Design a protein around this motif. Structure first.
Motif, PDB file in Angstrom:
ATOM      1  N   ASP A 126     -17.522 -30.375  -8.354  1.00 31.75           N
ATOM      2  CA  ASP A 126     -18.858 -30.577  -7.732  1.00 31.75           C
ATOM      3  C   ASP A 126     -18.888 -30.110  -6.248  1.00 31.75           C
ATOM      4  O   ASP A 126     -19.929 -30.229  -5.580  1.00 31.75           O
ATOM      5  N   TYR A 127     -17.761 -29.553  -5.761  1.00 34.06           N
ATOM      6  CA  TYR A 127     -17.604 -29.344  -4.290  1.00 34.06           C
ATOM      7  C   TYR A 127     -18.778 -28.548  -3.662  1.00 34.06           C
ATOM      8  O   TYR A 127     -19.274 -28.902  -2.600  1.00 34.06           O
ATOM      9  N   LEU A 128     -19.195 -27.492  -4.335  1.00 36.44           N
ATOM     10  CA  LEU A 128     -20.239 -26.621  -3.816  1.00 36.44           C
ATOM     11  C   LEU A 128     -21.634 -27.216  -3.897  1.00 36.44           C
ATOM     12  O   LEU A 128     -22.500 -26.681  -3.229  1.00 36.44           O
ATOM     13  N   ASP A 129     -21.838 -28.333  -4.624  1.00 38.29           N
ATOM     14  CA  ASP A 129     -23.084 -29.107  -4.533  1.00 38.29           C
ATOM     15  C   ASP A 129     -23.122 -29.844  -3.183  1.00 38.29           C
ATOM     16  O   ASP A 129     -24.183 -30.206  -2.696  1.00 38.29           O
ATOM     17  N   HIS A 130     -21.935 -30.118  -2.611  1.00 34.67           N
ATOM     18  CA  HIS A 130     -21.810 -30.840  -1.334  1.00 34.67           C
ATOM     19  C   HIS A 130     -21.751 -29.912  -0.125  1.00 34.67           C
ATOM     20  O   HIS A 130     -22.438 -30.138   0.908  1.00 34.67           O
ATOM     21  N   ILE A 131     -20.875 -28.943  -0.189  1.00 37.82           N
ATOM     22  CA  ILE A 131     -20.511 -28.092   0.926  1.00 37.82           C
ATOM     23  C   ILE A 131     -20.937 -26.664   0.611  1.00 37.82           C
ATOM     24  O   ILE A 131     -20.478 -26.052  -0.349  1.00 37.82           O
ATOM     25  N   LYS A 132     -21.841 -26.190   1.448  1.00 41.17           N
ATOM     26  CA  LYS A 132     -22.438 -24.886   1.268  1.00 41.17           C
ATOM     27  C   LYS A 132     -21.637 -23.710   1.762  1.00 41.17           C
ATOM     28  O   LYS A 132     -21.783 -22.598   1.219  1.00 41.17           O
ATOM     29  N   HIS A 133     -20.830 -23.939   2.803  1.00 36.78           N
ATOM     30  CA  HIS A 133     -19.971 -22.908   3.356  1.00 36.78           C
ATOM     31  C   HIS A 133     -18.499 -23.443   3.511  1.00 36.78           C
ATOM     32  O   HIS A 133     -18.096 -23.828   4.613  1.00 36.78           O
TER      33      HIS A 133
ATOM     34  N   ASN B 173     -16.812 -29.723   7.387  1.00 36.70           N
ATOM     35  CA  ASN B 173     -16.968 -29.857   5.946  1.00 36.70           C
ATOM     36  C   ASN B 173     -16.198 -31.077   5.511  1.00 36.70           C
ATOM     37  O   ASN B 173     -16.695 -31.886   4.745  1.00 36.70           O
TER      38      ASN B 173
ATOM     39  N   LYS C 194     -17.756 -34.455   6.284  1.00 32.11           N
ATOM     40  CA  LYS C 194     -18.916 -34.798   5.475  1.00 32.11           C
ATOM     41  C   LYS C 194     -18.489 -35.232   4.056  1.00 32.11           C
ATOM     42  O   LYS C 194     -18.922 -36.284   3.593  1.00 32.11           O
ATOM     43  N   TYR C 195     -17.621 -34.452   3.419  1.00 34.03           N
ATOM     44  CA  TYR C 195     -17.199 -34.725   2.028  1.00 34.03           C
ATOM     45  C   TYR C 195     -16.381 -35.975   1.896  1.00 34.03           C
ATOM     46  O   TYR C 195     -16.611 -36.762   0.990  1.00 34.03           O
TER      47      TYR C 195
END
Length: 121
Positions: A45-52, A84, A87-88
């Motif tokens: 799910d990482y890219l649902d959280h962190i865009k870059h 990043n 936040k995660y």
């Protein structure tokens, strides 16, 4: 042109200084938490959280292609690593705490790199 060459030599020299900066910053991460990209096999799910996403191996690839035009660009990528992570991950985790330590310790390295880039031109 000779001007294109001179500009190329400046980029090369900036690249050399950024490689030493990157080595120094990566020493402040002895657990290697930030060495590689977050695995999408292991955090699907990482890219649902962190865009870059960002990490030190990915910075190293960019660096060796002389892909950083200036220290600001390099710092943006370093900041993504830290930001990043903060936040995660929650405050009470080994990951968040490693980001805070890396931030605090890297500040010193980045403070002098800025003076060196300005100084040497």
């Amino acid at each position: 042109s000779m001007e294109q060459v001179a500009m190329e030599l400046r980029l090369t020299e900036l690249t050399r200084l950024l490689r030493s900066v990157l080595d120094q910053l990566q020493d402040k991460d002895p657990a290697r938490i930030f060495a590689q990209p977050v695995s999408l096999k292991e955090v699907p799910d990482y890219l649902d959280h962190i865009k870059h996403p960002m990490d030190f191996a990915t910075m190293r690839k960019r660096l060796e292609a002389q892909g950083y035009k200036n220290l600001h660009e390099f710092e943006e990528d370093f900041d993504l690593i830290i930001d990043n992570c903060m936040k995660y991950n929650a405050r009470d985790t080994v990951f968040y705490r490693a980001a805070v330590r890396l931030r605090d310790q890297g500040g010193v390295v980045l403070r002098q790199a800025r003076r060196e880039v300005d100084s040497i031109g």
